[PDB]
Amino acid sequence: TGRPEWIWLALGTALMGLGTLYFLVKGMGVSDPDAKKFYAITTLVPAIAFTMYLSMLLGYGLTMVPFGGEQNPIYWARYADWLFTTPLLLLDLALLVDADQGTILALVGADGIMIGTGLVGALTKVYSYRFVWWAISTAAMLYILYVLFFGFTSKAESMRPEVASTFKVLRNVTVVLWSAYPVVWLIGSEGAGIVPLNIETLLFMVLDVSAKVGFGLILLRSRAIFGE
Amino acid sequence: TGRPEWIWLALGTALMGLGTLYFLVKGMGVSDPDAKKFYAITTLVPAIAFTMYLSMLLGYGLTMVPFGGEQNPIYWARYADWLFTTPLLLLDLALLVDADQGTILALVGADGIMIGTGLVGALTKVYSYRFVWWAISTAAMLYILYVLFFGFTSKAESMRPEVASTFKVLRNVTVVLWSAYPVVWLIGSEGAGIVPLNIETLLFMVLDVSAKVGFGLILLRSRAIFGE
Amino acid sequence: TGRPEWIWLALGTALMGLGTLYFLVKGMGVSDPDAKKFYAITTLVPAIAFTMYLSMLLGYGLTMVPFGGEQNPIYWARYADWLFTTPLLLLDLALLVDADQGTILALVGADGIMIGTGLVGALTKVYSYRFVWWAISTAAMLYILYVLFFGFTSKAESMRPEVASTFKVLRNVTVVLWSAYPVVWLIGSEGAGIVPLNIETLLFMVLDVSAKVGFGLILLRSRAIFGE
Numbered sequence: 001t002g003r004p005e006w007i008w009l010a011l012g013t014a015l016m017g018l019g020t021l022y023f024l025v026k027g028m029g030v031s032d033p034d035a036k037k038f039y040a041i042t043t044l045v046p047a048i049a050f051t052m053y054l055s056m057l058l059g060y061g062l063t064m065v066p067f068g069g070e071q072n073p074i075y076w077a078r079y080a081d082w083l084f085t086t087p088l089l090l091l092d093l094a095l096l097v098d099a100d101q102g103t104i105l106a107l108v109g110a111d112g113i114m115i116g117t118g119l120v121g122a123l124t125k126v127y128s129y130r131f132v133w134w135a136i137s138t139a140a141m142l143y144i145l146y147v148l149f150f151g152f153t154s155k156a157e158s159m160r161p162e163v164a165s166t167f168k169v170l171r172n173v174t175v176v177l178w179s180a181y182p183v184v185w186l187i188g189s190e191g192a193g194i195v196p197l198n199i200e201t202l203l204f205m206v207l208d209v210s211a212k213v214g215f216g217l218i219l220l221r222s223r224a225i226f227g228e
Numbered sequence: 229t230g231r232p233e234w235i236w237l238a239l240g241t242a243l244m245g246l247g248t249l250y251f252l253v254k255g256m257g258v259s260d261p262d263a264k265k266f267y268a269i270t271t272l273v274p275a276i277a278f279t280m281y282l283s284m285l286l287g288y289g290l291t292m293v294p295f296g297g298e299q300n301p302i303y304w305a306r307y308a309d310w311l312f313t314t315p316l317l318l319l320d321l322a323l324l325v326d327a328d329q330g331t332i333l334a335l336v337g338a339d340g341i342m343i344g345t346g347l348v349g350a351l352t353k354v355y356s357y358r359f360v361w362w363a364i365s366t367a368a369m370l371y372i373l374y375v376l377f378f379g380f381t382s383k384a385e386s387m388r389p390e391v392a393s394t395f396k397v398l399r400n401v402t403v404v405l406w407s408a409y410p411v412v413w414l415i416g417s418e419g420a421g422i423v424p425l426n427i428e429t430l431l432f433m434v435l436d437v438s439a440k441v442g443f444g445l446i447l448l449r450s451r452a453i454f455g456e
Numbered sequence: 457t458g459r460p461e462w463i464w465l466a467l468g469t470a471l472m473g474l475g476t477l478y479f480l481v482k483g484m485g486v487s488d489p490d491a492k493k494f495y496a497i498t499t500l501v502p503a504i505a506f507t508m509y510l511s512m513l514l515g516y517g518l519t520m521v522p523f524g525g526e527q528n529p530i531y532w533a534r535y536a537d538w539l540f541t542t543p544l545l546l547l548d549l550a551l552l553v554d555a556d557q558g559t560i561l562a563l564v565g566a567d568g569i570m571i572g573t574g575l576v577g578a579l580t581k582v583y584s585y586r587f588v589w590w591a592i593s594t595a596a597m598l599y600i601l602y603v604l605f606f607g608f609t610s611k612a613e614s615m616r617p618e619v620a621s622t623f624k625v626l627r628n629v630t631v632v633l634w635s636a637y638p639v640v641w642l643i644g645s646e647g648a649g650i651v652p653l654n655i656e657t658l659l660f661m662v663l664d665v666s667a668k669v670g671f672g673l674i675l676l677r678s679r680a681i682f683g684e
């Protein structure tokens with residue numbers, strides 16, 4: 001069913017909307033052309049998350065998928081949200097470290113595959129097949145995290161200390177936060193229903209707010225976004 | 229029902245196809261690398277609109293959405309059309325004024341949110357919820373128009389007189405034309421059915437032709453597209 | 457029905473996965489910033505094709521479309537695959553010849569129209585209307601092939617012999633391979649069912665493997681990807 005978890009959806013909606021408003025206000029007085037790019041990328045993340053959480057709260061972002069001999073509530077809007085927000089987050093990191101175009105395309109492509117296959121897995125009717133998609137999606141995520149942890153760090157070391165240190169924090173946060181998603185998916189009602197949809201939703205909400213507002217706070221409050 | 233308004237859909241389809249053919253022919257003899265970008269962006273707009281209007285005329289682009297205790301005809305293809313055409317129009321304006329990358333991303337993102345939420349609103353089954361989406365979409369549009377009217381104009385003033393004057397005309401046309409969409413939506417069968425689907429369709433057709441052919445005519449017939 | 461052709465879907469899935477793994481391994485030791493872009497673009501093509509063929513094999517990528525007085529199996533995942541892979545292939549060619557941004561946008565836009573209308577045609581319930589979409593899609597393809605054969609070749613001649621010769625081979629392969637798709641569509645169960653779904657699927661599989669692995673082999677094994 002899709003009703004008890006409504007509270008986490010409303011809180012999520014509220015936190016994304018507030019985070020968006022905050023980034024918007026904070027970015028009005030900025031003139032630095034570089035920081036300006038960071039504000040545009042980072043402000044869009046929670047703006048999108050706001051619309052997606054609201055769709056889940058209202059019901060539009062919820063669908064029913066049969067599997068395991070039953071109709072299961074699946075929040076497809078979670079994926080529509082991630083489809084656009086994760087590439088943006090990747091872009092933030094890429095700009096901070098001045099990543100090559102080829103590597104950015106590789107990451108965005110891997111990221112689209114990660115979310116796309118995750119969504120296919122969420123809407124798959126054959127229970128067993130859902131885990132095949134989960135595995136492929138997780139493999140794509142690991143590829144991304146690998147490149148971000150090893151490739152970008154080396155790139156970050158060529159920057160001034162402020163950029164390098166802020167990237168390190170965002171990098172660590174990213175590896176931990178992102179890795180948590182496939183685990184929650186696996187234990188929740190979408191994979192092995194070890195935890196109820198109610199707790200599943202709360203966990204994804206905490207993760208999303210941390211990734212779509214927390215990440216942005218750390219970045220936009222640092223001096224690293226200023227090119228100088 | 230979806231039959232009486234067929235005439236506006238056929239006229240729309242014909243006007244978009246002709247506008248596409250015209251821009252195509254007109255752009256063949258162009259060598260200026262800058263003008264060339266304007267032709268590619270501007271010619272794609274009605275080409276896309278052509279396929280979308282044709283889908284609406286044939287029926288593919290029409291769906292039924294229950295709300296208000298009835299099954300209502302909703303032309304989702306109108307939105308699929310706008311999803312790709314509005315960002316292109318924004319790109320035309322951006323190139324004309326040499327807008328920063330961060331501002332272009334902000335606009336395109338706001339634009340995707342505008343159309344995306346508008347579509348969610350059009351497919352929402354709870355009558356009352358439809359207006360919440362309309363409001364969010366309108367807020368995103370106002371953000372875009374604000375940046376285009378104030379931000380781009382200042383940017384346009386740094387260009388030669390021909391570019392500045394052509395931008396001013398396109399700017400004024402854009403603010404007036406775009407603002408008309410949420411009003412038509414609000415009075416039509418998608419919001420408060422004050423006007424029938426028949427007139428609703430005709431109004432959107434006039435607006436679309438003006439925006440996807442009229443805008444292009446003003447731009448491609450001006451010398452502003454030449455960088456020199 | 458969607459069962460006998462399963463073998464071509466499994467072979468396709470296997471070949472795309474292997475081609476992806478091969479490109480991945482082959483690209484690990486590359487440092488040339490230019491070649492690196494080619495590897496990212498080219499490796500993503502079969503990675504995407506892998507997920508799409510797997511969805512068709514598992515059943516997710518298969519839908520039923522009524523027309524001709526019957527429910528017909530339609531592999532929509534074929535189109536979802538092409539939607540992302542063809543623009544990438546176009547990008548490979550564009551980078552090899554250093555095509556202008558306006559021409560790249562024109563091609564990608566024409567390409568999205570080509571696949572999008574092809575998909576609309578595949579999901580159209582009115583038999584006769586399916587061919588209208590096929591014609592529009594084919595017209596867009598011809599536009600693309602025209603620009604690739606005449607426009608890019610001239611651009612390729614300004615490059616060193618290795619780039620020019622490799623482009624010529626990729627160009628010829630592209631014109632022949634791509635042109636084959638609308639023909640297979642036309643003779644298969646999606647258009648005039650002259651050939652059964654079983655052979656239709658096998659033919660598209662041979663074409664896809666040739667285009668998503670064969671094309672990449674020719675490119676990534678050449679010295680043309682090195683800018684120097």
Ligand SMILES: CC(C)CCC[C@@H](C)CCC[C@@H](C)CCC[C@@H](C)CCOC[C@@H](COP(=O)([O-])OC[C@H](O)COP(=O)([O-])O)OCC[C@H](C)CCC[C@H](C)CCC[C@H](C)CCCC(C)C
Nearest residue numbers: 103106110139140143151154155473480495496499500503
């Ligand atoms: C069933 C399977 C067949 C299907 C697979 C599932 C699949 C869907 C999931 C995988 C995701 C996949 C789609 C991703 C596509 C990636 C592709 C586009 C990549 C193209 O490649 C782009 C480069 C970017 O490199 P750069 O950053 O520009 O480096 C520059 C220079 O080296 C300096 O670096 P410095 O800063 O550190 O000093 O990838 C980075 C280069 C790295 C240096 C090398 C990385 C190597 C990889 C981590 C190992 C790859 C795995 C192996 C082939 C085998 C394992 C298979 C697994 C299925 C068990």
Ligand SMILES: CC(C)CCC[C@@H](C)CCC[C@@H](C)CCC[C@@H](C)CCOC[C@@H](COP(=O)([O-])OC[C@H](O)COP(=O)([O-])O)OCC[C@H](C)CCC[C@H](C)CCC[C@H](C)CCCC(C)C
Nearest residue numbers: 017024039040043044047331334338367368371379382383
């Ligand atoms: C319920 C709500 C929480 C949810 C909100 C609904 C939401 C879905 C709709 C809003 C759309 C939103 C998604 C848009 C995202 C925008 C974000 C990406 C922007 C990032 O920011 C990008 C910059 C681009 O700036 P620049 O052009 O490069 O300027 C350079 C220099 O200043 C010279 O300029 P010159 O040429 O004129 O001289 O935005 C331009 C900077 C401008 C100068 C300043 C603009 C300020 C705004 C107009 C005011 C913003 C509104 C306020 C926060 C509060 C109102 C809230 C409303 C809900 C009532």
Ligand SMILES: CC(C)CCC[C@@H](C)CCC[C@@H](C)CCC[C@@H](C)CCOC[C@@H](COP(=O)([O-])OC[C@H](O)COP(=O)([O-])O)OCC[C@H](C)CCC[C@H](C)CCC[C@H](C)CCCC(C)C
Nearest residue numbers: 245252267268271272275559562566595596599607610611
């Ligand atoms: C029912 C109909 C109304 C609907 C139509 C169906 C439609 C959906 C299918 C068509 C696809 C359409 C959407 C494509 C949009 C294209 C548009 C964005 C193009 C904008 O234009 C971009 C340019 C790119 O040019 P460049 O490469 O940068 O060249 C630079 C310089 O010239 C040096 O060149 P060098 O290297 O060779 O030396 O297009 C290349 C310029 C070329 C040089 C000139 C090409 C001309 C065309 C081949 C002819 C166009 C056709 C005619 C208008 C009429 C036929 C209509 C048909 C329906 C029968």
Ligand SMILES: CC(C)CCC[C@@H](C)CCC[C@@H](C)CCC[C@@H](C)CCOC[C@@H](COP(=O)(O)O)OCC[C@H](C)CCC[C@H](C)CCC[C@H](C)CCCC(C)C
Nearest residue numbers: 256591592593594595596597598599602605606607609610
């Ligand atoms: C939807 C589809 C239908 C619409 C397609 C659009 C198309 C009709 C218009 C194409 C227009 C452009 C060529 C515009 C003119 C450009 C001018 C500079 C003139 C040059 O035109 C020469 C070449 C292109 O070379 P360049 O552009 O690099 O120079 O045309 C290439 C000419 C080629 C060689 C001929 C065209 C071949 C057609 C496909 C076959 C026609 C049938 C023949 C009668 C059969 C011949 C076979 C015999 C051997 C049995």
Ligand SMILES: CC(C)CCC[C@@H](C)CCC[C@@H](C)CCC[C@@H](C)CCOC[C@@H](CO)OCC[C@H](C)CCC[C@H](C)CCC[C@H](C)CCCC(C)C
Nearest residue numbers: 083108109112113116117120123504507532535536539540
């Ligand atoms: C240059 C680079 C930036 C490009 C990198 C390519 C990278 C984006 C690709 C990841 C690809 C893919 C593995 C993920 C897509 C799977 C998706 C088709 C499945 C959706 O499920 C559709 C079902 C649901 O009932 O209906 C079936 C209904 C219809 C018959 C299906 C029609 C589907 C269309 C093809 C739309 C697909 C939507 C994509 C998810 C949007 C990607 C946006 C991107 C720009 C971030």
Ligand SMILES: CC(C)CCC[C@@H](C)CCC[C@@H](C)CCC[C@@H](C)CCOC[C@@H](CO)OCC[C@H](C)CCC[C@H](C)CCC[C@H](C)CCCC(C)C
Nearest residue numbers: 048051076079080083084311336337340341344345348351
């Ligand atoms: C770098 C920048 C250019 C990026 C900027 C990000 C900006 C594009 C985002 C706007 C985001 C969003 C608010 C709008 C999307 C809402 C959409 C999910 C709702 C569609 O409704 C789907 C329902 C209909 O029955 O079915 C449910 C069916 C399936 C279960 C749903 C699967 C949906 C997929 C996630 C596809 C979404 C399609 C997008 C509309 C395409 C955007 C293209 C863009 C490149 C212009």
Ligand SMILES: CC(C)CCC[C@@H](C)CCC[C@@H](C)CCC[C@@H](C)CCOC[C@@H](CO)OCC[C@H](C)CCC[C@H](C)CCC[C@H](C)CCCC(C)C
Nearest residue numbers: 276279304307308311312539564565568569572573576579
């Ligand atoms: C700068 C440049 C790169 C941009 C160039 C623009 C170029 C991409 C556009 C080609 C446009 C168009 C002709 C093709 C789209 C047709 C598509 C809407 C039809 C899908 O059919 C949807 C039906 C199926 O049951 O459901 C109806 C269900 C819902 C009510 C429909 C909501 C649909 C959304 C609008 C999503 C459309 C998905 C696109 C196919 C994705 C394009 C990705 C691109 C980045 C490669």
Ligand SMILES: CCCCCCCCS[C@@H]1O[C@H](CO)[C@@H](O)[C@H](O)[C@H]1O
Nearest residue numbers: 123124125126129513514515516517
């Ligand atoms: C007597 C046996 C009756 C079996 C009926 C089952 C038809 C199942 S289709 C199934 O749909 C999912 C969601 O679309 C895809 O994820 C799967 O891959 C695909 O296989």
Ligand SMILES: CCCCCCCCS[C@@H]1O[C@H](CO)[C@@H](O)[C@H](O)[C@H]1O
Nearest residue numbers: 057058059060061351352353354357
């Ligand atoms: C006795 C009461 C029975 C109520 C049944 C109503 C289920 C309504 S779902 C509804 O679907 C729309 C379109 O998907 C979304 O836009 C809305 O937000 C969502 O709420």
Ligand SMILES: CCCCCCCCS[C@@H]1O[C@H](CO)[C@@H](O)[C@H](O)[C@H]1O
Nearest residue numbers: 285286287288289579580581582585
């Ligand atoms: C007595 C006559 C009853 C006729 C019922 C037919 C309704 C057909 S809708 C049809 O759906 C397709 C797929 O969506 C679109 O491709 C077509 O363009 C559109 O026309």
